[PDB]
Design a protein around this ligand. Structure first.
Ligand code: CLA
Ligand code: CLA
Ligand code: CLA
Ligand code: CLA
Ligand code: CLA
Ligand code: CLA
Ligand code: CLA
Ligand code: CLA
Ligand SMILES: CC(/C=C/C=C(C)/C=C/[C@@]12O[C@]1(C)C[C@@H](O)CC2(C)C)=C\C=C\C=C(C)\C=C\C=C(C)\C=C\[C@@]12O[C@]1(C)C[C@@H](O)CC2(C)C
Ligand SMILES: CC1=C(/C=C/C(C)=C/C=C/C(C)=C/C=C/C=C(C)/C=C/C=C(C)/C=C/C2=C(C)CCCC2(C)C)C(C)(C)CCC1
Ligand code: SF4
Ligand code: SF4
Lengths: 98, 159, 205, 80, 62, 192, 41
């Protein structure tokens, strides 16, 4: 039996810490290099896709590191997923002797 | 043994097939005079069948459920004579014929009229080239390493 | 000054000019026609001659002395399957490593002549050979023979290559005779001596 | 309504004009070849598409080309 | 252009003898000739001819 | 220099530490590839050098075989026994999580380096004794790379000898070689 | 006689002679070594 609240909390905290402090420069410069989906040398919105205008009100940040709410969602989703993976693996009841 | 196949000598169905064939041949034989030519021919066929079955049984061939020999070609040391040895012999012979043909073509290419020698074969030159094909692997590796086997400037179409 | 040929009335191929020892103009299949191959084939023939001479002196002489009775060595074609102080596979691996070292050094000499003439550990040794395939020096030429004027080394090198060719043929014959007639070579010689017109290769085959 | 084009590799041997069964081609004075003449295709409305001109042209690749297009009662070769 | 008797390689891309050697026959020295060089080959093309006219910049010195 | 008299490749002049012109496959022809390969060789070699003492010392002191040392995992329970004493935090999930987080942070910190020389040889906080100040850098680098290559070969030998003789360690195989050398060798595996 | 030798060197005649010799050789081999399914050596 594994504690659900404790496991999810610890896993999500670990993933959020990794995203905020460890892998943040790598994510930032890799997304800077792969800038935007571009067709014929111009972005979709500038090519004329009105539905493809980037939302910036949903990307405003106040962290010194520029950490964004979408980043929160991504790292938290990874945290919930890893926590549930650990919970299911612990409660699986499958213990093969290797 | 391999893939659940039994040896031909141990197998039943191989012997059953031999018995059936011999019985059919003797049933045919029952219609002729003992000393006539058809009787001698049928007896020769019977002896040939017996010899063939004995050789197949004694050579070490695997046998299926239906009673017929099966071949193993995965490289097994106990069944090299089934595939690997005839394959090597064929590779030698085919390389010989191909190599001597290529050599004759190359030698004819520099002539007064190559097409005439292309339809009407220069028999002495052909015989010389053909006799020099015994050691074709050595010459082939020699030209492969010497850089005189492949070409680099060949005609191609609009890419 | 036309040297004798393998086939009287013929003419020697262009690449075989007559300078190499044991040159009888014999190359019907043009195996050394291209300029590069001749040196490689010369080295191969030298090493084959020497290995075959060793094999002949190790096959025929022990069998002869066993037939006389001075020694008691087993037959050559079954001496591999005996009991030794070491396992057969271990001996094979050990010889692969030692021969790897020796043959790598010989290869380095063949590719770049005069490049491995010196001892890698003690640089004061410096083998004193000049011709590829004839290393010379103290290790391989102790008594100092075979270091003389040109056309004088020709005779001794021809002697070596011809005895080696004879040894090669003898060893191949010993192999095939052992395979066919499951007896040692000396007993086969005695059989051909006693009944020459019946004990031949034809046999009852 | 086929289209016939002449390219500047022409040598003016006049074989295409002689081969044409409907008098589509003709020779025109030119500079750029030893014969100093080139082929022209003014009556392309009468071309049937037989490609005899292409068969008669000596050149690595053809100096006269026929591109099949819209079909007409003259192009279809109909006598009825 | 190349002198008579030269061996040249065809560089015209739609030519049948592309990357093949030729034999220069005659060069026209008139100022306005567009393909003055005449080259003869060994094998015939699909149409069955073995001679063509080429520009000096569609041939190689080898 | 790896083969006496052999010509040396153009890119491998002979200035880098442990450079003997050994490159039969021509994998270092691309310059950026060569720099990456230099750094990766250093990292693989340093890891092997730091590893193999932990392969030998436990077996010498017992209670360890570097393959049975991982045996407690992949077994229900047994999350204990570092040095004959149980580990209070020996559970597999916490061990895995701690190792992943710590090594990820350390390695990402390493990855944030611009100068290739500092990529290979950081210095500073990693040289408390200042060995890199005694004007013996070339010889020290040569010694490091030579011992590291030897350690890499030794660990490959460890792995292959574990494959060939399951349930045994390196020192046990050495004692087997010493017990009867001429009938206990690689011939028993290469030649069945 | 030179013309006869040239005619006998044409492709169809040489092919006929070569394939006849090859077929005869194979037929004789199968007469003396019949029913050969696997190579004994
Ligand atoms: C990709 C297919 C493939 C190829 C290329 C080879 C190639 C070879 N096999 Mg082979 N083999 C195969 C599949 C294959 N095997 C399969 C599926 C089996 C069944 C398990 C075998 C069983 C087999 C045996 C039993 C032996 C070989 C042997 C050999 C070698 C002679 C040669 C290298 C021989 C060998 O290597 O001897 C040591 C040998 O004795 N093979
Ligand atoms: C080692 C290779 C080799 C090979 C394959 C041959 C092969 C041959 N030699 Mg020969 N020969 C050789 C080396 C060789 N020789 C050497 C080293 C010498 C010493 C110079 C001779 C001296 C020699 C003579 C003197 C004659 C032959 C002849 C012959 C031919 C017939 C021999 C026979 O008994 O029938 C045969 C083609 C005979 C022949 O048929 O000549 C036309 C012949 O008269 N050979
Ligand atoms: C190619 C060279 C060669 C090779 C591979 C061998 C190999 C062998 N010799 Mg041998 N031998 C050789 C040349 C060679 N010999 C020569 C030139 C002479 C002379 C002898 C005289 C000789 C004797 C007298 C004996 C061997 C024996 C042996 C066997 C065990 C030797 C050990 O060590 C081994 C099969 C011994 C053995 O077991 O007999 C076969 C043995 O008693 N050899
Ligand atoms: C009948 C056989 C035979 C003959 C005539 C020669 C002759 C020669 N060898 Mg050779 N050799 C032979 C067999 C022979 N060898 C065998 C079987 C091996 C393998 C071990 C070698 C290994 C070999 C080496 C490594 C070297 C030579 C060298 C030489 C030359 C030195 C002269 C000499 O030693 O006296 C010849 C008289 C005898 C050998 C009487 C035999 C009793 C000379 C050309 C050396 C050379 O090439 O020049 C410096 C040299 O470095 N030999
Ligand atoms: C060159 C050295 C040499 C010598 C001195 C001998 C001598 C002998 N061989 Mg031998 N042989 C040799 C090479 C040699 N052979 C080679 C190279 C092969 C083929 C690889 C054979 C294959 C062979 C077989 C299969 C048999 C002999 C047999 C014999 C003996 C009877 C003679 C005979 O049938 O000749 C036949 C010899 C040949 C067909 C080889 C050609 C001879 C070369 C060209 C010289 C005799 C002692 C017979 C035997 O043991 O009888 C008791 C026998 O059955 N030999
Ligand atoms: C590459 C570096 C490396 C790695 C991954 C390991 C990993 C390991 N070592 Mg180890 N070790 C290393 C270097 C390394 N060692 C070196 C350099 C030495 C020499 C000082 C040792 C000496 C050593 C001993 C003496 C023992 C181990 C043990 C162990 C195992 C238990 C881990 C544990 O609970 O420790 C974490 C504990 C506190 C943080 C583990 C597999 C133990 C083992 O396997 O016993 C079964 C054990 O007894 N190691
Ligand atoms: C770093 C150098 C090194 C050293 C000192 C050793 C030392 C040893 N190895 Mg070894 N080995 C090494 C690298 C090394 N190995 C590598 C790189 C490989 C992979 C190819 C192997 C694969 C290997 C096998 C497969 C075997 C040995 C064995 C042995 C032992 C007997 C010697 C022998 O047969 O060889 C000995 C303790 C043998 C052994 O321990 O059996 C008793 C054995 O069977 N080794
Ligand atoms: C891919 C096609 C293929 C293959 C691989 C085979 C293979 C075989 N056939 Mg088959 N066959 C085929 C097509 C094929 N056939 C077709 C299309 C027909 C109908 C025309 C036949 C009709 C046929 C008959 C009627 C017979 C064979 C036989 C044979 C066997 C050859 C006997 C032998 O070793 O001769 C030995 C010949 C050599 C070793 C040649 C040596 C050449 C030089 C001298 C060596 C150096 C062999 C298993 C015979 C057999 O025994 O079957 C079991 C047999 O009687 N086949
Ligand atoms: C025959 C031979 C080669 C023959 C080649 C020929 C004819 C080539 C002829 C031609 O190419 C030419 C020249 C020119 C071409 O234009 C035409 C042809 C016609 C193609 C090599 C033998 C080579 C023979 C060799 C190398 C023999 C080595 C023997 C050894 C090592 C023996 C070891 C042991 O016998 C001991 C001592 C005792 C025990 O231990 C047991 C063992 C282990 C068996
Ligand atoms: C402000 C601030 C702060 C704080 C912070 C915080 C508190 C944060 C948090 C955060 C968080 C806390 C987040 C989270 C998130 C989460 C998420 C986002 C999730 C998701 C999930 C999912 C997506 C899931 C899925 C699934 C399902 C549904 C089922 C099963 C399977 C799975 C798992 C897959 C501090 C103090 C530092 C200071 C500074 C400022
Ligand atoms: S396709 Fe026929 S009709 Fe048309 S131009 Fe050519 S020859 Fe004349
Ligand atoms: S056939 Fe070709 S080269 Fe001749 S005139 Fe017509 S288009 Fe010109």
């Amino acid at each position: 039996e594994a504690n659900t609240a404790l496991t999810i909390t610890l896993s999500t905290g670990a993933l959020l810490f990794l995203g905020r402090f460890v892998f943040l420069p790598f994510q930032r410069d890799n997304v800077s290099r792969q800038g935007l989906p571009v067709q014929n040398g111009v972005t979709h919105f500038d090519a004329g896709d009105s539905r493809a205008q980037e939302v910036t009100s949903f990307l405003k940040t106040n962290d010194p590191a520029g950490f964004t709410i979408v980043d929160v969602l991504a790292w938290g989703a990874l945290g919930h997923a890893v926590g549930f993976f650990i919970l299911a693996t612990i409660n699986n009841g499958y213990n093969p002797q290797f | 043994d391999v893939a659940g196949l039994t040896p031909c000598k141990e197998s039943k169905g191989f012997a059953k097939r031999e018995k059936q064939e011999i019985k059919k041949l003797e049933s045919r034989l029952k219609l002729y005079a003992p000393d006539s030519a058809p009787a001698l021919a049928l007896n020769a066929t019977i002896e040939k069948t017996k010899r063939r079955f004995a050789f197949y049984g004694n050579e070490g061939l695997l046998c299926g459920t239906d009673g017929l020999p099966h071949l193993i070609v995965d490289g097994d040391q106990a069944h090299l004579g089934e595939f690997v040895y005839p394959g090597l012999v064929f590779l030698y012979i085919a390389g010989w014929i191909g190599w001597v043909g290529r050599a004759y073509l190359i030698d004819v290419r520099t002539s007064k009229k190559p097409t005439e020698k292309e339809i009407i074969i220069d028999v002495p030159l052909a015989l010389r080239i053909m006799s020099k094909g015994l050691t074709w692997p050595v010459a082939a590796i020699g030209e492969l390493r010497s850089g005189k086997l492949v070409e680099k400037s060949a005609n191609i179409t609009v890419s | 000054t036309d040297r004798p040929l393998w086939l009287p009335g013929s003419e020697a191929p262009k690449w075989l000019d007559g300078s190499l020892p044991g040159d009888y103009g014999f190359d019907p299949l043009d195996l050394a026609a291209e300029p590069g191959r001749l040196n490689w084939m010369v080295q191969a023939e030298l090493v084959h001659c020497r290995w075959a001479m060793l094999g002949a002196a190790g096959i025929f002489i022990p069998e002869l002395l066993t037939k006389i009775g001075i020694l008691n060595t087993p037959s050559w074609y079954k001496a591999g399957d005996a009991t030794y102080f070491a396992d057969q596979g271990t001996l094979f691996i050990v010889e692969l490593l030692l021969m790897a070292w020796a043959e790598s050094r010989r290869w380095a000499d063949i590719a770049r002549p005069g490049s491995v003439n010196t001892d890698p550990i003690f640089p004061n040794n410096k083998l004193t050979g000049t011709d590829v395939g004839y290393p010379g020096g103290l290790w391989f030429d102790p008594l100092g023979w075979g270091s003389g004027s040109e056309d004088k080394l020709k005779e001794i090198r021809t002697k070596e290559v011809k005895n080696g060719r004879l040894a090669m043929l003898a060893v191949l014959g010993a192999f095939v005779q052992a395979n066919v007639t499951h007896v040692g070579p000396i007993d086969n010689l005695f059989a051909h001596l006693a009944d020459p017109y019946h004990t031949t290769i034809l046999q009852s085959l | 309504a086929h289209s016939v084009k002449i390219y500047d590799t022409c040598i003016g041997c006049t074989q295409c004009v002689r081969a044409c069964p409907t008098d589509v081609l003709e020779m025109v004075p030119w500079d750029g070849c030893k014969a100093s003449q080139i082929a022209s295709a003014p009556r392309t409305e009468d071309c049937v598409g037989c490609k005899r001109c292409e068969s008669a042209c000596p050149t690595d690749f053809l100096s006269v080309r026929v591109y099949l297009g819209a079909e007409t009662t003259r192009s279809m070769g109909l006598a009825y | 252009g190349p002198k008579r008797g030269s061996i040249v390689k065809v560089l015209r891309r739609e030519s049948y003898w592309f990357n093949d050697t030729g034999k220069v026959v005659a060069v026209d020295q008139a100022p306005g000739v567009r393909y003055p060089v005449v080259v003869r080959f060994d094998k015939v093309n699909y149409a069955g001819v073995s001679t063509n006219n080429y520009s000096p910049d569609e041939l190689e010195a080898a | 220099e790896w083969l006496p008299g052999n010509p040396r490749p153009s890119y491998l002049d002979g200035s880098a530490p442990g450079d003997f012109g050994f490159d039969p496959l021509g994998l270092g022809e691309v310059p950026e590839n060569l720099e990456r390969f230099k750094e990766s060789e250093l990292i693989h070699a340093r890891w092997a050098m730091l590893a193999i003492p932990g392969v030998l010392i436990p077996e010498a002191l017992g209670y360890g075989n570097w393959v049975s040392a991982q045996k407690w995992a992949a077994t229900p329970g047994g999350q204990a026994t570092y040095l004959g004493n149980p580990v209070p935090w020996g559970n597999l999930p916490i061990i895995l999580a701690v190792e992943f987080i710590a090594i990820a942070f350390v390695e990402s910190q390493r990855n944030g380096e611009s100068d290739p020389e500092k990529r290979k040889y950081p210095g500073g906080p990693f040289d408390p004794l200042g060995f890199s100040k005694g004007a013996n850098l070339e010889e020290l680098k040569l010694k490091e790379i030579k011992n590291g290559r030897l350690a890499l070969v030794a660990f490959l030998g460890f792995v292959v000898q574990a494959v060939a003789y399951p349930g045994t360690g390196p020192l046990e195989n050495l004692k087997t070689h010493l017990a009867d050398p001429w009938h206990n060798t690689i011939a028993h595996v290469l030649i069945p | 006689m030179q013309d006869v030798k040239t005619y006998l060197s044409t492709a169809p005649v040489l092919a006929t002679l070569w394939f006849g010799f090859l077929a005869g050789l194979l037929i004789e081999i199968n007469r003396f070594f019949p029913d050969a399914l696997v190579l004994p050596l």
